[PDB]
Design a protein around this ligand. Sequence first.
Ligand code: HEM
Ligand code: HEM
Ligand SMILES: N=C(NO)Nc1ccc(Cl)cc1
Ligand SMILES: N=C(NO)Nc1ccc(Cl)cc1
Ligand SMILES: N=C(NO)Nc1ccc(Cl)cc1
Ligand SMILES: N=C(NO)Nc1ccc(Cl)cc1
Ligand SMILES: [Zn+2]
Lengths: 416, 414
Amino acid sequence: GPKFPRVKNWELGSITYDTLCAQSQQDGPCTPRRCLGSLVLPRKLQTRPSPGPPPAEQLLSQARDFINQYYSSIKRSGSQAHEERLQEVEAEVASTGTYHLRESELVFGAKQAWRNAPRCVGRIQWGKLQVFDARDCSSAQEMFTYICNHIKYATNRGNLRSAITVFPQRAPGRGDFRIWNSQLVRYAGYRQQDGSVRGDPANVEITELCIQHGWTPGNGRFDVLPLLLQAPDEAPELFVLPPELVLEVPLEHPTLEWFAALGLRWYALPAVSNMLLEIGGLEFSAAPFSGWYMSTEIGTRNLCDPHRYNILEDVAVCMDLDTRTTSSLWKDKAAVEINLAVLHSFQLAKVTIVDHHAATVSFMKHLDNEQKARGGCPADWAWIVPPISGSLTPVFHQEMVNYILSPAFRYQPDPW
Amino acid sequence: KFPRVKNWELGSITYDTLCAQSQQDGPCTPRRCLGSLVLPRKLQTRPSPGPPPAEQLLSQARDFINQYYSSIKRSGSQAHEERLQEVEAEVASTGTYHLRESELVFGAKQAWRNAPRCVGRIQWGKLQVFDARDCSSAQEMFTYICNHIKYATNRGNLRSAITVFPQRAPGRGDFRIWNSQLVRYAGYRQQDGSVRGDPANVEITELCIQHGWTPGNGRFDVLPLLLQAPDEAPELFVLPPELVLEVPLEHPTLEWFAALGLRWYALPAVSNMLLEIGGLEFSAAPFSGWYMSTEIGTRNLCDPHRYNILEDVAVCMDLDTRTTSSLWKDKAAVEINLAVLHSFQLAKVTIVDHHAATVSFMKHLDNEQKARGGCPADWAWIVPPISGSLTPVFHQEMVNYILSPAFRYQPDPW
Ligand code: HEM
Ligand code: HEM
Ligand SMILES: N=C(NO)Nc1ccc(Cl)cc1
Ligand SMILES: N=C(NO)Nc1ccc(Cl)cc1
Ligand SMILES: N=C(NO)Nc1ccc(Cl)cc1
Ligand SMILES: N=C(NO)Nc1ccc(Cl)cc1
Ligand SMILES: [Zn+2]
């Protein structure tokens, strides 16, 4: 039949063909010999620091592709403005070695980047992103202002709004704008004398870096870290976020009255800040983005992962379960109640959140829209299926095709 | 080339060098990954009307023979050299060859060992191999299949086993077991397109009826077997009820669960897969071990296109099925898996929960890293259908590739 991947949904028996993968211009990590789809950070997109200006030849073609996507999106492909814009980009890259995007071009690109992210299950919302243009930012202090505004607009007192703030792109042999923290909101991770960790083990390094840079550390389990912001060719500066701006949700359970005594909590805004946004060859090293949480991210991963808060055993003990044997399914029981507590608490505090059932269903709708709109949707099965109750959701039974499309969000090396 | 494999829970790192031994292509390319696809689009097992390319078959055979003698530490020995000559001789004169029983045993175990989607491979060295290559009729297949079932079941103390029927031959039909498993519950399509029983078995159920089976009307009616000898219509055989061990499902604390009348068989014996050893193909080679509780409790009983009992259990538990956020699906699913575990343990029938199973697979990964320098594994299948990140395999990166001997899918004989 069609010379494209045949995709099947085993629950409904329906079939589709992905023709969109034909548009991918960047190789992934797999080969006919072996599949490397499970690797978290395969040395592929990895935007390793490329100091010396990029080959005008490679950049120009990437730029040309992006401009074609843009004009196609506004239904003016082949027009006079399209050919003139193409000329303008080539000319600019010819004299300066690089080029700049127009406002509307940035907005379209940022949205496409989200839309193109294979691992994001919340892409049904891709068309609704508030793009803050911060390309005029010239200091670490101004970065903080832009970030504080982002948090305020995005948090919106609990009625969260997706947003992204874009700082200046990487320039020819010049220092990058960088946000050292992986997220705008992170709990400190304090290395203990016995080797253990108090707080979030995932943030041990960034916490120590904050201390090395003058931060006076606390000693709690949920201490909000300050931000280490870095302007070009300058050392990072430390900034403490005002408490009133960081909305947190104390966790309680709908029926287990003791759950609240656990003193657990999580912040409302998931704002990733260490990823690079690539559009038409241009690289925005600092471009924090945020949406809202899917409950399993908090209740299953951040709270139950063995290398994170690891509260599974504590909750099971409180539930008086037999943690001495696997077949009692104590981990499964506790995990469920913990996820329920998260959903319940966020709802109680009127903070936006979506459970894994609602989210995955909406993603199936997204796949249908995308099938019609672009002929497919790049998706990473291992990341789209939730960490708990996987086969209980519709996505588990849906085959997916994974590939890299640009604009895109990519991981990049740590600045230190 | 050689992929760096990391475990994100422990931070440990290994390098898979075993993948370099792969001689068969998967569905992925640098352009796009198709790891989530269940079946191959082309990596099928096309007809066998003509003799396979002598050159190709000879290379696959020499490699297998090589693997075998290395397994018995007699590589380069006189026996090794002479056996290779024997295989050379047969292929050149007949276009094919035959394996010795000891070779067949080694190959079967290796095929299981190499299966990327199998989480129970730590047991790979313990497999009872029945040589049924001297079978010339469906009736004889039935007798072999019955002995496999008696042996494997062992009155609840399940033992891993495989029975191997005659290999495929050029221009001749294949021996085939039409059922996908030796034990399957009927799926009857009724009135308004609904289904009484197992929806997964609707087609096989009707084929059985068309071939003379007098169908029942229950939710768990054990299907008869359709066995097919070369170029012959398949024959119908009813399995002796005393050979099919089943486990009534009840819950440890929820008294009403037993009233649901749910149940499942003890023996998971896949019979529609093809076993390939040294280029030779075994179209009928049913294999079995024991169930991992999630296969029954989660997939078989909770999949929307299967028994789909989630809502019923939820209502019995009087849960808020009005909204997703109440996590009623998650709560019901957990109790169902608990019921399956409770029941099998009560009935004294071998079963393994997903936590235990995954822990043992991690040990297997380590055993294989030292033994062969890697282990082909399919993340999507190794991770259980529920509580994924609560198991260690979720946090372990894996490299997937095809090694031979191997088990593979084949076209349905109709
Ligand atoms: C509207 C709410 C949203 C929800 C519910 C959502 C949820 C998720 C989830 C569950 C993941 C996987 C997390 C993990 O397993 O580590 C994810 C990944 C991702 N999301 Fe979304 N997302 C949303 C908004 C956004 C926004 C606003 C953007 C960007 C503009 C975005 C970009 C991404 C990217 C790039 C990844 C992949 C990260 C990686 O490579 O590990 N998401 N999202
Ligand atoms: C001893 C107990 C065993 C357990 C607990 C076990 C468990 C499993 C599970 C859970 C799967 C995944 C099925 C699914 O995703 O629905 C699987 C797949 C597989 N197992 Fe095992 N297994 C065991 C023994 C065996 C034996 C004896 C063989 C053969 C000699 C075998 C061959 C396979 C094969 C070929 C697959 C891959 C199926 C495919 O590619 O679709 N297993 N096993
Ligand atoms: N809900 C989320 N975002 O809005 N979660 C989320 C978590 C991590 C990354 Cl990298 C990207 C997204
Ligand atoms: N993860 C699995 N385990 O059985 N299976 C599986 C089921 C459906 C699709 Cl689409 C992909 C994989
Ligand atoms: N428990 C099992 N085997 O022993 N289950 C099982 C189910 C399907 C396939 Cl294909 C292979 C194995
Ligand atoms: N499926 C995931 N979603 O977050 N993550 C994940 C974690 C570890 C490995 Cl090895 C592979 C994938
Ligand atoms: Zn792949």
